[PDB]
Structure 1
């Protein structure tokens, strides 16, 4: 069994017991979180959403709220004395998928 869920502005194929990194949710480590937008359920019984599978949900535990490894965004324009340096660490929420309720 697996599901395609819509979280962030993105979609992720998830199995039960799978750790996934997603855009930051308003949640805390320990909290169960619920994905309500299941586009497709795979495995033995195949639900195709149109666009969503009605009544399907995926629960997940929040493991961690973090920020990713740092990106130094550096940009310059040759001959124009234009440089711009900016650090970036994108927030994420790490979740373990508990149950896919088709």
Structure 2
């Protein structure tokens, strides 16, 4: 299982586990390799001088879509203030294949 900085925030990843990360274009349908793998694991080929030299992980970008709509609504509890922000969040349904040590 592989630990990957794409984010910037880190994911535990085995091969095939669908992982939602940031919007990264990836032209959804194409393939992107991930480039900051810490802690190969399994046989514990453990990190050192951060980033296992070239232990990258390929991934097949499938979908680029927005999250649930979330209503940011802050209001001051007197004083007549109302700020109602509809909000979306862009993910990318990254499908991950061939953890490469």
* Structure 2: stretches of 5+ with no match in the other structure: none
The 1-side partners of 2:77 and 2:94 are apart by 44
- The answer (yes or no) to whether the contact 1:39–1:50 under 8 Å persists in 2 is no
- TM-score (normalised: structure 2): 0.94
List per-residue Cα deviations over 1:44-69 (Å, max 9, x = no partner). 24232421111110000011000000
Cα distance per residue 1:12-37 (max 9 Å; x no partner): 11000110000111212221111110
Q: Which has the higher strand share?
A: 1
Larger CA deviation: 42-51 vs 91-100: 42-51
Worse overlay, 23-32 or 87-96 = 23-32
When the two structures are aligned, how many residues end up with a matched partner?
Answer: 101
Q: Secondary structure at the match of 1:48?
A: coil
TM-score, length basis structure 1: 0.93
- DSSP-derived class of the 2:33 partner: strand
